[PDB]
Design an enzyme around this catalytic site. Structure first.
Site, short mmCIF file in Angstrom:
data_model
loop_
_atom_site.label_atom_id
_atom_site.label_comp_id
_atom_site.label_asym_id
_atom_site.label_seq_id
_atom_site.Cartn_x
_atom_site.Cartn_y
_atom_site.Cartn_z
N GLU A 28 0.83 -1.20 0.00
CA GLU A 28 0.00 0.00 0.00
C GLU A 28 0.87 1.25 0.00
OE1 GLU A 28 -2.41 -0.35 3.45
OE2 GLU A 28 -0.76 -0.10 4.88
N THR A 82 1.24 -8.93 3.95
CA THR A 82 2.49 -8.57 3.30
C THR A 82 3.70 -8.98 4.13
OG1 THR A 82 2.72 -6.39 4.31
CG2 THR A 82 1.26 -6.57 2.42
N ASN A 99 7.41 1.54 19.66
CA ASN A 99 8.43 1.58 18.62
C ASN A 99 9.72 2.23 19.11
OD1 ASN A 99 6.41 0.51 17.10
ND2 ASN A 99 6.08 2.32 15.82
N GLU A 136 29.19 -14.09 16.92
CA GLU A 136 29.30 -14.64 18.27
C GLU A 136 27.93 -14.88 18.86
OE1 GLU A 136 31.81 -12.10 20.56
OE2 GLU A 136 33.61 -12.56 19.39
N1 LIG Z 1 4.31 -2.52 17.57
C1 LIG Z 1 3.53 -2.28 16.52
N2 LIG Z 1 2.68 -3.26 16.06
C2 LIG Z 1 1.88 -3.02 14.99
C3 LIG Z 1 1.92 -1.80 14.36
N3 LIG Z 1 1.04 -1.83 13.34
C4 LIG Z 1 0.46 -3.04 13.30
N4 LIG Z 1 0.96 -3.79 14.34
C5 LIG Z 1 0.59 -5.19 14.65
O1 LIG Z 1 0.93 -6.09 13.61
C6 LIG Z 1 -0.16 -6.93 13.29
C7 LIG Z 1 -0.78 -6.45 11.98
O2 LIG Z 1 0.19 -6.58 10.97
P1 LIG Z 1 0.24 -5.51 9.78
O3 LIG Z 1 1.57 -4.80 9.79
O4 LIG Z 1 -0.90 -4.52 9.89
O5 LIG Z 1 0.11 -6.36 8.43
P2 LIG Z 1 0.62 -5.72 7.05
O6 LIG Z 1 2.12 -5.78 7.00
O7 LIG Z 1 0.11 -4.31 6.90
O8 LIG Z 1 0.00 -6.70 5.94
P3 LIG Z 1 -1.27 -6.22 5.08
O9 LIG Z 1 -2.46 -6.04 5.98
O10 LIG Z 1 -1.58 -7.24 4.01
O11 LIG Z 1 -0.94 -4.90 4.41
C8 LIG Z 1 -1.13 -6.79 14.44
O12 LIG Z 1 -0.79 -7.69 15.46
C9 LIG Z 1 -0.90 -5.37 14.90
O13 LIG Z 1 -1.18 -5.26 16.27
C10 LIG Z 1 2.78 -0.81 14.82
O14 LIG Z 1 2.82 0.28 14.26
N5 LIG Z 1 3.58 -1.06 15.90
N1 LIG Z 2 43.00 -9.88 32.19
C1 LIG Z 2 42.30 -9.58 31.08
N2 LIG Z 2 41.45 -10.48 30.58
C2 LIG Z 2 40.77 -10.12 29.46
C3 LIG Z 2 40.93 -8.90 28.84
N3 LIG Z 2 40.10 -8.85 27.73
C4 LIG Z 2 39.47 -10.02 27.71
N4 LIG Z 2 39.83 -10.84 28.74
C5 LIG Z 2 39.32 -12.19 29.02
O1 LIG Z 2 39.63 -13.09 27.97
C6 LIG Z 2 38.48 -13.91 27.66
C7 LIG Z 2 37.93 -13.52 26.32
O2 LIG Z 2 38.90 -13.90 25.34
P1 LIG Z 2 39.17 -12.98 24.06
O3 LIG Z 2 40.42 -12.18 24.24
O4 LIG Z 2 37.97 -12.15 23.73
O5 LIG Z 2 39.40 -14.07 22.90
P2 LIG Z 2 39.48 -13.65 21.34
O6 LIG Z 2 38.08 -13.32 20.87
O7 LIG Z 2 40.05 -14.81 20.59
O8 LIG Z 2 40.38 -12.46 21.24
C8 LIG Z 2 37.51 -13.67 28.81
O9 LIG Z 2 37.78 -14.54 29.89
C9 LIG Z 2 37.81 -12.22 29.19
O10 LIG Z 2 37.44 -12.00 30.53
C10 LIG Z 2 41.86 -7.93 29.37
O11 LIG Z 2 42.10 -6.81 28.92
N5 LIG Z 2 42.52 -8.35 30.52
MG LIG Z 3 -1.30 -3.23 5.52
#
Ligand SMILES: Nc1nc2c(ncn2[C@@H]2O[C@H](COP(=O)(O)OP(=O)(O)OP(=O)(O)O)[C@@H](O)[C@H]2O)c(=O)[nH]1
Ligand SMILES: Nc1nc2c(ncn2[C@@H]2O[C@H](COP(=O)(O)OP(=O)(O)O)[C@@H](O)[C@H]2O)c(=O)[nH]1
Ligand SMILES: [Mg+2]
Ligand SMILES: Nc1nc2c(ncn2[C@@H]2O[C@H](COP(=O)(O)OP(=O)(O)OP(=O)(O)O)[C@@H](O)[C@H]2O)c(=O)[nH]1
Ligand SMILES: Nc1nc2c(ncn2[C@@H]2O[C@H](COP(=O)(O)OP(=O)(O)O)[C@@H](O)[C@H]2O)c(=O)[nH]1
Ligand SMILES: [Mg+2]
Lengths: 430, 48, 48, 442, 430, 442
Positions: D70, D144, D227, D253
């Site tokens: 729409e 949609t 939102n 990760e």
């Molecule tokens: N959090 C949040 N939920 C929404 C919002 N608008 C609709 N919803 C929810 O999403 C569901 C409705 O989905 P829609 O997004 O209206 O469906 P659509 O994507 O427009 O699909 P069509 O009706 O075919 O156009 C309901 O559960 C609504 O409560 C919004 O603005 N925020």
């Molecule tokens: N002593 C110390 N430990 C660290 C430090 N940074 C991360 N660690 C530890 O090392 C581990 C994470 O490993 P990491 O270095 O992220 O592995 P990598 O992702 O392979 O580099 C965890 O136990 C952390 O608490 C630091 O600056 N000092």
């Molecule tokens: Mg719609």
């Protein structure tokens, strides 16, 4: 006798940054690279860690590797980051995904050749090469996979030198990652075959050091990485300054390792004491020895009271008598005789160095080989066995390509290492 | 004296076109909306 | 109005630029003064 | 680094408006896409690059498409305040709606519009150098959202392959309802979504209404509030890409840590310091209280009760002034609690993240300004109750083929209903089997 | 000992203009032609490239030939263009049309007598004539066809001198012209009979040099032509300045060519390094030697690791020790011994010259005779066979008048050249 | 350096007005032929010489003839704004049209007019010193364009010989049509044009209408828009003669590179940044984006789909701020694509050109102003589909001799229809044979 450093992953690069801060401070090198020191003793061994660039400058012999440049951009943005050589920064374009198999097999093999090319370019420039030094965590993804890959390649290319690693291993309490047991088991399997000597650190022990000993109110990773940089810079101190009884990494390995698989050690540094109390009690070898053997000052979760010492070494920095060192190490061995393995007549090696760290009259770093490390490996094996029976997250690793037989092999090798430690702990002579 | 502003640049080429009467009733001539607009646009100057 | 184009990428003859008041669209490329003789001859860039 | 946003239908576009207002206000982009000309910070940092591309004249433009059948909602975007931000080609609108028929969107009407969408996505993906996923916003209750979401995810999954696809999806609430045919559309959507999505985030409007009643003091909420909350959650998950921090978390990760088996990828979301301005100056807001908060049932944005299940994995995102020791103490305190239970095959149950950028304050907003926040995404067996209730409502309607003649006339075989209902029944059995506790002692 | 230069076609004229810029700078010649240098070392060999005109002026001994004057009008408008003798510009009235047969047979025979008249006028003025120097591309039309025509005529008229060429050859990835394989094959057929030494450059290799080593964001053809002008002016440096171990083009040929067909060489120039990195590394003979053999620094797409070195030559400029040069060449030969042909006891020649180019402390240019050149010829022969089987564009050439037998002869000769390289690669002592 | 333009009939003269408007605006010549006193040059320049000659009093006059059988269009040129630009002798007009009969133009009426045209072309060629080809503009759908264009090309080919002749030709669109007898005239034209042209570029009005609706926002285009687009294309192709550049391209290299066999000389044309001013400032326009654009069928100016055939050669002309390394990277990326296919006997498929002068913007024009553009001419087997539909329409009418009495009355043997139809059948078979893979290696 020069060392080449490699920093891998986020933890490794950050600890390395703090290490190069401590070493650059000790030799008086400005962050621009200019020498500003105040004694020839600083200059006479600067070659050990620094290469000399033209017109005065010094550059640090280190290679940095990571899969996303975020860490690389953070260290380059740091206060001493400029000192590093630009060509030494290697990075990819996609992450390890916290997956060992991805870091070892898919993105690892793509970049690894460029890392070996840089390491060889750095190694072949040395007039005589001593061992390599690597910092990484075992619980991560790129740290574990690429660290063990690079260790394997360097052991193939330089089998006669020394291989040294500093490694962070998962605490039983601080769960930072869900898949820690797999990465730890595979990495220890690689290390026990490839490494010559490996040092292990628990983040929980650094937290307990900071809260109980230093009474810090709000510690941060800068403090933990400073403590690690202090021990790392301390082990090499005897390589680069004079002393009454010199020591070397190979001599440490020869005195500490009885059998080639038993090469995992605990570390400690003694003169940690709060700034308020230090004015009321002077440093002396009995005081250093008492802090040195107190488990409060040890950087592992396992406690010495549950194991036995095979060997230990203490390296002292500062101007002190050798007589006090000799009598303290004899008295401590005689008074606590039940905790030392009896088929070795003297378990402690001592070393003395003339130059202490700035602002301390004396300091010692302690390295200990104790069977209580078996409790930590047993814990990792337990968490692996709980996770493996149900195939909890295996499809990611199998999708990268690993055969399941690797997991059973790595578990078997860790279980045999724990058994071997337990067997030498409970051996007896009749 | 053309200003370097964005909207002036966007509409200057359209303003000088030689086929202005043929664009009436389309989405180009509505200055209050972005192009390819869907709603109704008048085609007589009294309504415009 | 008309002007004379610059010659950043080469060339020796002058070129005519038509209607400079209209600002061109699209991204302008990244440029720097780094050339190949500055790199292959100026080793004395730093007097350390 | 880069991420591409795809907005489908009415809910997804309206939530998109809140997302892009928020992302503009955090970076500082004016509504017309130009950086402030009087601002001279000098450190022209790259963080925008995740969401914006530059033209070269310094205008900013965003990495998004707006898709609707729409015209009215897209014409509202075209005539609104953000007219100059979007490229006009990016705003795609059809002629006529899918009329609450999944079949109409998928077979009859979406088939004409779908090739423009793929051409735009290709044109975006070609202007990238480290694309690391798609973010998709849609509702499965409408026509949609169901039809184009399924068709577009299928085509994206064949063309792009391994690239990750993360969906934020608004599901039909358990007693609030907007249309009669919602169960049919949700079943048919979930059948396609099972094969073609990497992580699925679960939302229920009744939970966000309850959260706005209990924590905020709002008696008469409207869609702009919901939102804005959703936009804050998305900003929290994507903040790890954009700012410096202690423990970063790449989008791969999430998939590695949250998904144990390839079908068990539907996750719950919650946000802690949702608080009003008058309450905020009476209380300190430490780490341990908000960590305790994200586990309280008053905090979830999905209408499910986690006390009826077991957690498999949790991902905790902290942003702002937080220290790792407080995160560690909090997680250890949570682990001590007796009413929080993890499946016995998952011993290391937690993933942590710590980011330095505090949450942004929006000029018209209703949230207070706070120095720290935590956001949680978690995988739990309780989600099985939501599917069971949708399937029961389907069985009630389907016993008489109550509306099926519309779907069969608009192009669908009757057989597709039974296939989809059996697939969702199998998903229920998967959640029964994974939650089994067994003794290997045998 | 003076050289005569010929510049042909667009590529040749463009590279030549930059070459004569570099040479005029090195000897301190003003663009008006006045000598303005600052050492006698510049003046005492100026005769090698310049002739002296009356009241101060010097003129460069070069002939410029092209079929359409567009390039000549561009070079005449340049900053040094005035130096060239007006009578030395020879041009026609219609282009080569990118066709070898047109360039060789129709406008070639029309112009060739006036170029030969100018070349003879220049040669007979010399007191002793050294070799000719020719710059052209092989992929073009007038460059390849008319360049090889002129080469054949000069080889008829001066068979006892040396003929040396620098030549640009088609990239492996993207063509600039559709009919490149025919023009390349016919030109290589002419060169392998007529030439004494031929140098080859890939535009792709210059792009990779710029991007990887110099990290240039937006390189231009001026940079590529500067690299070529640098090597061209470097090869002749020992001819025209003093040194501890003089060398000569004939001496290069005698040491480089084992057998008369094996005369195609790779080129490199060493102290290339980005403005950001230059603060991090001082110049030294080990650094230059290590960079000199890195395939990153080689100006062709083929890589040495897929072949073997028959011979190599290094020319050093600067004040340096002979000990470092000889021991470096020995160490490189010993450590990589599998990549050097074993039936030659020493593969590298060195030469040392006292005077470096201005603003560099030292420089080396590297010339290498490596069997990996066979891959380029094999690739060109493959593309020729695909095109020739279908007569893809042949009617143009046949309409100019060529017999197909020329095409079959040229294909057979290239295939025999590839076979000869492969045979010498796999030879053994037995 | 010099080129002579020949304009025939209605389409060719109307396209000529736009071309000469553009060439004036690019060089800076006023409509009356006098260079303004302000357009000074630091050094004396010759680039105008390709299109203008000076009398010595400083008036400029162009190297063109306008040929027509009806007076109205040439009288429109004589009474318009450009009255003083053209030499009045150059503008030749007859009394009465060829009435959509090829036979009337070729046999009856053009035979009287052709000798004046030949005398004018000779008078032009005598005032040259490096003539390097003819450019011809005509449509093959009408009577005088086909018949007199063929007769004049035959005479030029005998008198001037080897000199190249390049044609720009408007062919009958595949479903838009203007006259009933278009197939007969196009077949009979194409028979003569086959022997006596070196490359022929094909245009269809339906494609330029699609391009102006889709890319530009024009609902109601007219011939002035199409003619301005064609003029831009011609300016892009001839820019290589007129301005400095990295890789220049003479008209003889086109003939050498694009034509594999002497009958296979029909080429497709496309132009990349056809874009409106409002769209142009929302997007960057890098080299790789426009290179990817020219291969998409949305960029083409002829209604054919190249996915149904194989490319034999492509010639890519870049003008403006472009650097060769990006062109090389772009062409290698194009070569990687799987939906772009080249015949296996053509391995080196590409020709490149790079010129520094960016495309000009015309005050009343509808294209935006842009820093760079690329133009493509390409040879592809897909063109065989274009001939087959004309041949089918010819067969439909000719089976019943639907209109032949007009052609027979104005002087043509019935046999000429069958000869031309057999020649086009042989051209279809040539396109079948050239595209067949050669795989008999044993
Ligand atoms: N959090 C949040 N939920 C929404 C919002 N608008 C609709 N919803 C929810 O999403 C569901 C409705 O989905 P829609 O997004 O209206 O469906 P659509 O994507 O427009 O699909 P069509 O009706 O075919 O156009 C309901 O559960 C609504 O409560 C919004 O603005 N925020
Ligand atoms: N002593 C110390 N430990 C660290 C430090 N940074 C991360 N660690 C530890 O090392 C581990 C994470 O490993 P990491 O270095 O992220 O592995 P990598 O992702 O392979 O580099 C965890 O136990 C952390 O608490 C630091 O600056 N000092
Ligand atoms: Mg719609
Ligand atoms: N693009 C374009 N097409 C045109 C133009 N004028 C005519 N045509 C097309 O060309 C075909 C008609 O050819 P004409 O040029 O009118 O034929 P003619 O040359 O005048 O021949 P006679 O009718 O005998 O005078 C139709 O398909 C028209 O659509 C024009 O100005 N631009
Ligand atoms: N390095 C370099 N290569 C060039 C230059 N000009 C053209 N080329 C290359 O030479 C080939 C074209 O040959 P060309 O000189 O045009 O042949 P010609 O027409 O006979 O003069 C293509 O591969 C171009 O890329 C230049 O200035 N420098
Ligand atoms: Mg007419």
């Amino acid at each position: 006798r020069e060392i080449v450093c490699v920093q891998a992953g986020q933890c490794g690069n950050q600890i390395g940054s703090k290490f190069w801060e401590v070493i650059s401070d000790e030799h008086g090198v400005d962050p621009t690279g200019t020498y500003q020191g105040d004694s020839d003793l600083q200059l006479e061994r600067i070659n050990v860690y620094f290469d000399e660039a033209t017109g005065g400058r010094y550059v640090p012999r280190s290679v940095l590797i990571d899969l996303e440049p975020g860490t690389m951009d953070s260290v380059r943005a740091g206060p001493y980051g400029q000192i590093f050589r630009p060509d030494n920064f290697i990075f990819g374009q996609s992450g390890a995904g916290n997956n060992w198999a991805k870091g070892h097999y898919t993105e690892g093999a793509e970049l690894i050749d460029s890392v070996l090319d840089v390491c060889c370019k750095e190694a072949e420039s040395c007039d005589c090469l001593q061992g390599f030094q690597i910092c990484h965590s075992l619980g991560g993804g790129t740290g574990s996979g690429m660290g063990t890959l690079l260790i394997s390649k360097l052991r193939e290319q330089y089998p006669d030198r020394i291989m040294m690693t500093f490694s962070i291993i998962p605490s039983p309490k601080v769960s930072d990652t869900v898949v820690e047991p797999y990465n730890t088991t595979l990495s220890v399997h690689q290390l026990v075959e490839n490494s010559d000597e490996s040092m292990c650190i628990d983040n929980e022990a650094l937290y307990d050091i900071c809260f109980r000993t230093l009474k810090l109110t709000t510690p941060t990773f800068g403090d933990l990485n400073h403590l690690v940089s202090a021990v790392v810079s301390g082990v090499t101190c005897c390589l680069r300054f004079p002393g009454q009884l010199n020591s070397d990494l190979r001599k440490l390995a020869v005195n500490l390792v009885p059998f080639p698989r038993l090469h995992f050690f605990m570390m400690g540094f003694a003169p940690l004491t709060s700034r308020g109390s230090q004015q009321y009690r002077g440093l002396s070898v009995p005081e250093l020895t008492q802090q040195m053997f107190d488990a409060k000052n040890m950087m592992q979760a396992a406690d010495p009271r549950h194991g036995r010492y095979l060997t230990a070494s203490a390296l002292f920095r500062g101007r002190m008598s050798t007589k006090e060192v000799d009598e303290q190490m004899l008295n401590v061995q005689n008074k606590n005789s039940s905790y030392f393995i009896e088929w070795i007549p003297n378990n402690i090696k001592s070393s003395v160095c003339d130059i202490p760290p700035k602002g301390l009259k004396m300091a010692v770093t302690f390295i200990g080989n104790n069977t209580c490390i078996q409790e930590m490996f047993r814990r990792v094996g337990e968490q692996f066995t709980l996770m493996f029976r149900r195939k909890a997250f295996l499809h990611w690793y199998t999708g990268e390509g690993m055969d399941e037989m690797e997991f059973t092999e790595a578990e078997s090798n860790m279980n045999d290492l724990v058994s071997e430690y337990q067997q030498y702990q409970d051996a007896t002579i009749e | 004296p053309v200003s370097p502003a964005l909207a002036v640049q966007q509409r200057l080429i359209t303003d000088m076109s030689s086929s202005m009467p043929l664009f009436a009733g389309t989405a180009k001539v509505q200055k209050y909306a972005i192009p390819r607009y869907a709603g109704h646009v008048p085609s007589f100057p009294r309504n415009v | 109005m008309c002007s004379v184009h610059s010659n950043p990428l080469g060339g020796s003859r002058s070129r005519l630029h038509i209607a400079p008041q209209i600002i061109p669209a699209g991204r302008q490329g990244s440029r720097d003064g780094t050339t190949v003789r500055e790199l292959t001859s100026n080793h004395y860039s730093s007097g350390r | 680094r880069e991420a591409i946003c795809i907005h489908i239908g009415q809910a997804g576009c309206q939530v998109g408006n809140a997302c892009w207002e928020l992302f503009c206000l955090e970076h500082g982009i004016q509504p017309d896409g130009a950086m402030p000309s009087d601002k001279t910070i000098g450190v022209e940092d790259d963080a925008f690059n995740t969401f914006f591309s530059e033209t070269g004249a310094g205008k900013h433009v965003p990495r998004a498409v707006f898709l609707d059948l729409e015209p009215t909602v897209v014409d509202e975007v075209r005539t609104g305040t953000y007219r100059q931000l979007f490229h006009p080609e990016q705003l795609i609108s059809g002629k006529e709606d899918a009329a609450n028929n999944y079949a109409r969107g998928h077979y009859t009407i979406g088939k004409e519009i779908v090739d423009l969408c793929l051409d735009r996505i290709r044109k975006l993906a070609d202007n990238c150098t480290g694309l690391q996923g798609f973010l998709v916003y849609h509702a499965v209750g409408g026509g949609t959202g169901s039809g184009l979401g399924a068709l577009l995810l299928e085509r994206l999954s064949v063309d792009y392959g391994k690239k990750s696809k993360l969906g934020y999806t608004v599901y039909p609430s358990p007693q609030v309802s907007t249309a009669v045919v919602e169960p049919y559309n949700s079943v048919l959507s979930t059948h396609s979504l099972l094969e073609h999505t990497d992580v699925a985030a679960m939302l229920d409007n009744e939970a966000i209404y309850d959260l706005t009643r209990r924590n905020l003091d709002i008696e008469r909420p409207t869609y702009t509030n919901l939102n804005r909350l959703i936009g804050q959650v998305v900003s929290s998950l994507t903040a790890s890409l954009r700012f410096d921090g202690a423990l970063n978390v790449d989008l791969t990760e999430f998939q590695t840590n949250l998904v144990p088996y390839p079908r068990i990828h539907f996750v719950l979301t919650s946000y802690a310091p949702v608080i009003s301005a008058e309450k905020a100056y009476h209380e300190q807001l430490s780490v341990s209280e908000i960590s305790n908060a994200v586990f309280e049932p008053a905090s979830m944005m999905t209408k499910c009760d986690p006390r009826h299940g077991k957690y498999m994995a949790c991902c905790l995102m902290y942003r702002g002034d937080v220290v790792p020791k407080d995160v560690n103490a909090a997680v250890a305190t949570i682990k001590t609690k007796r009413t929080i239970q993890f499946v016995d095959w998952s011993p290391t149950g937690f993933k942590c993240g710590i980011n330095y950028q505090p949450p942004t304050v929006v000029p018209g907003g209703d949230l207070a300004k706070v120095q720290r926040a935590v956001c949680m995404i978690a995988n739990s067996t309780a989600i099985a109750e939501v599917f069971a209730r949708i399937d029961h409502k389907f069985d009630l309607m389907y016993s008489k083929r109550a509306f099926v003649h519309w779907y069969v006339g608009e192009g669908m075989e009757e057989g597709e209903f039974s296939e989809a209902r059996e697939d969702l029944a199998a998903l229920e059995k998967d959640y029964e089997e994974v939650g089994a506790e067994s003794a290997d002692m045998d």
